[PDB]
Structures are given as C-alpha cells and as structure tokens.
Paper text:
Here we focus on EndoE, a multi-modular glycoside hydrolase secreted by Enterococcus faecalis, one of the leading causes of healthcare-associated infections. We provide X-ray crystal structures of EndoE, which show an architecture composed of four domains, including GH18 and GH20 glycoside hydrolases connected by two consecutive three α-helical bundles. We determine that the GH20 domain is an exo-β-1,2-N-acetylglucosaminidase, whereas the GH18 domain is an endo-β-1,4-N-acetylglucosaminidase that exclusively processes the central core of complex-type or high-mannose-type N-glycans. Both glycoside hydrolase domains act in a concerted manner to process diverse N-glycans on glycoproteins, including therapeutic IgG antibodies.
EndoE-GH20 crystallized in the P 1 2 1 1 space group with one molecule in the asymmetric unit and diffracted to a maximum resolution of 1.4 Å. The quality of the electron density maps allowed us to trace residues 489–835. The GH20 domain adopts the conserved (β/α)8-barrel topology with an overall size of 55 × 50 × 39 Å. A long and open groove, including a deep pocket, runs parallel to the protein surface and contains the active site. This groove is located at the center of the (β/α)8-barrel and surrounded by the loops connecting β1-α1 (loop 1; residues 499–505, pink), β2-β3 (loop 2; residues 530–541, brown), β5-α4 (loop 3; residues 598–603, orange), β6-α6 (loop 4; residues 660–670, light green), β7-β8 (loop 5; residues 706–724, blue), β8-α7 (loop 6; residues 729–740, green), β9-α8 (loop 7; residues 754–771, light blue), and β10-α9 (loop 8; residues 804–813, red). In a first step, D661 stabilizes the reaction intermediate and orients the acetamido oxygen for nucleophilic attack on the anomeric carbon to form an oxazolium ion intermediate. Structural comparison of GH20 domain of EndoE with LNBase showed that the conformation and length of loops 1 and 8 in EndoE-GH20 could block the entrance of an extra carbohydrate moiety linked to GlcNAc (-1), confirming the exo-activity of this domain. The GH20 domain of EndoE cannot accommodate bisecting CT N-glycans due to the presence of bulky and hydrophobic residues in loop 7 that block the access of the additional β(1,4)-GlcNAc to the binding site, as in the case of the GH20A domain of StrH.
Numbering used by the authors:
A (entry chain P): 2 to 6
B (entry chain A): 489 to 835
C-alpha cells in the first residue's frame, strides 16, 4: 500500500 | 501521485560501453525504477551524434571538425583506455532496449560547468578563450561566442533526445569548481550571475520548445536565496542534491517550491563515488546504511513533506580511473529498491 504524503 | 524513481550513472567522466548501459537499464527495470539518468556530458562528452555540425556566430563548423574536436577534448580530460564516446547507433540501441523494459532515459549534457572536453573542443575550433578565467571545466559567461557555441551543441543533443525522452537535464551545477567552491558567490558579486540566469532560461526554452521538461541541479539556482539577479523559469525541475555548507550558500528546497519549481529529490545521502568503499567521500557503506534511514521523500534540509516528483539515486566516477564495480552498483540498486519498495512498484 501507499499513503497520501 | 505515484513518484518516479531514478538510477543515475556518471558516464561522462568514465566511458561505459553500450552493453554495460543495457545491463544497468535491465537491472533498473527489474528493480522497479521508472527512469535511468544517463550522464553523458560531465567533464567528458562521451556521446557524439552522427551530425555534430553547427552554424553559430556567423560561422559553420562541419561534423568532421566538431566530432574530432570533442574526441580530442575527451582525451585531454581523461584518455580512457576503455573508450572515448558512444555513437548514435549505440544510443539508438540503448534507447530501444530501455523502451522495451519500461524505462525512460533522462540524458544529462552538463553546462556551464563540468565541460572540460567541450572547452578543449572550442579551443581546437579557434574559439578564443572559452573558459572562465582560471578554470579548465567551466565556460566563460562573458564570452558570447563560446556560450552560443555551447548552446548550439546542447541544442543538437536536445533535438536528438526529444524523440525518446521526457526530461532533459542540463546540469548547471558547480560553476568553476575545479578552482574552488566559491564560483557562484563570485559570479554574483561580479554581476555575471545575471547572465547565468539568462543562460539557464535559454536552455530551458530550447528544451521546452523540443517538447521536453528541463531539469538542473539545485546549487546554482537562486544561489544565496537571491532572486534579485533575475528569476528562473519555474518549469526547470530542480534536482536537489545538497543543502549547502559553510561558504556554499544554496537555496533551501522550500524556496524553489514557493516559486513553483518541481523537486526531484537527489539526496546526497544516497550518493556513491565509485572506488570510495570505506574511505573518502560518499562511501559505499554509508550509502547502503542511509537507504534504511532516510525516507524516500526526505530532501536535504527541506521542511517536512515538501512535494517531490520522485527521487534519484546516483553513482559517480569522480576519478574515472577507478574500475567498473557493477557488483557494488547492483547491491546499491537492490538496497535502494528494497528499502523504497512501496514507491517502486514491481510484479
Ligand atoms: Ca563509512
Ligand atoms: Mg554545470
Ligand atoms: Mg523560479
Ligand atoms: Mg541555490
């Protein structure tokens, strides 16, 4: 997964 | 958005053969990088087009003279036993190899610094005093004939790569750094930094007119955090490698973001100078260790969470007599991609 930085 | 991930190789100081660059591109693809930055003009100019002829300053210089002049310039910088320059047929082959493996190539043809070979070439072509006084590596921004010749040469590489690449890195780092680290400060006090702003903007326009995005290293752009010599085209992507040091007063990353530049994180924590294994600058062990410390998005001295478009991991051949060390290069690339896997998607 990957977040919204 | 998803971020780019770039492996950069210094094939300007040191000759790399075409199959070596292919192996690097294959490794980059395997490891989930999106791009390979191929430094070709960096002290040496180790890629020569089939037609290097230029018409500039009211004079014509044919391919024979220009190509031979560049080859002599390469040998004056470092007569590398392994080779002098890649050919256009070789570069066409390399670009096709990258395309088949989902890798974009970012070329670098450096100026106004890091251009020893092109300076010698200009001298052989009868252009008087092209170098900035004291330097064998940097063109004199006060010498319009030398500057215009340099721009004409860069334009030839821009035209060639425009069919293949999205970003063109004109470099722009380390003005007159064979003399000392004070080159940008001296350009500012002398007044000539205004002409550097114009030069960078001129190259940016050449690149944009060819359909690509321009990129430069950060250190000379808004040096001393000073916009009063002129503004830079905000479409210049900033490859941000150093936050500076004592007497090397470079703008912070946020300075560029406030002005609308995109940032390509080129953190020198990830640098490796080939041959510096456990001693010297930019050592192998430190590069590996820093890949498990820095976040992918950590820009030197940046305020937290400035936007970036991606990150660039660099291998340098400051001393091109050092051997190829692909075993260490591949360990560095493996370690970078494993630590930054969530940003570097692979099957
Ligand atoms: Ca160390
Ligand atoms: Mg430069
Ligand atoms: Mg600007
Ligand atoms: Mg700066």
């Amino acid at each position: 997964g990957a977040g919204a930085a | 958005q998803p971020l780019k991930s770039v492996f950069s190789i210094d094939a300007g100081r040191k000759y790399f053969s075409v199959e070596q660059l292919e192996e690097l591109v294959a490794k980059a693809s395997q490891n989930g990088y999106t791009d390979v930055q191929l430094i070709l003009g960096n002290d040496g100019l180790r890629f020569i087009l089939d037609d290097m002829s230029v018409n500039v300053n009211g004079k014509k210089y044919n391919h024979n003279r220009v190509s031979k002049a560049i080859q002599r310039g390469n040998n004056a910088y470092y007569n590398d036993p392994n080779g002098n320059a890649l050919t256009q047929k070789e570069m066409d082959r390399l670009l096709a190899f990258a395309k088949a493996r989902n890798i974009n190539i970012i070329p670098v043809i450096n100026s106004p610094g890091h251009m020893d070979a092109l300076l010698v070439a200009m001298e052989k072509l009868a252009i008087k005093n092209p170098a900035f006084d004291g330097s064998k590596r940097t063109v004199d921004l006060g010498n319009q004939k030398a500057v215009n010749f340099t721009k004409a040469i860069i334009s030839k590489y821009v035209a060639y790569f425009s069919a293949h690449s999205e970003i063109f890195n004109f470099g722009g780092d380390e003005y007159a750094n064979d003399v000392d680290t004070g080159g940008w400060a001296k350009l500012q006090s002398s007044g000539r930094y205004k002409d550097f702003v114009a030069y960078a903007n001129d190259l940016a326009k050449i690149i944009k007119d060819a359909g690509m995005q321009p990129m430069s290293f950060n250190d000379g752009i808004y040096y001393n955090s000073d916009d009063s010599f002129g503004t830079f085209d905000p479409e210049i992507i900033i490859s941000y490698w150093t936050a500076g040091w004592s007497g090397y007063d470079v703008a912070k990353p946020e300075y560029f973001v406030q002005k609308g530049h995109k940032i390509f994180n080129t953190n020198d924590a990830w640098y490796w100078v080939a041959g510096n294994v456990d001693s010297g600058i930019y050592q192998y062990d430190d590069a590996l260790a820093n890949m498990s410390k820095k976040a992918f998005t950590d820009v030197p001295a940046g305020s937290p969470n400035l936007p970036i478009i991606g990150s660039i991991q660099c291998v340098w051949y400051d001393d091109p007599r050092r051997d190829y060390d692909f075993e260490r290069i591949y360990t560095l690339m493996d370690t970078f991609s494993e630590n930054y896997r969530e940003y570097m998607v692979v099957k």
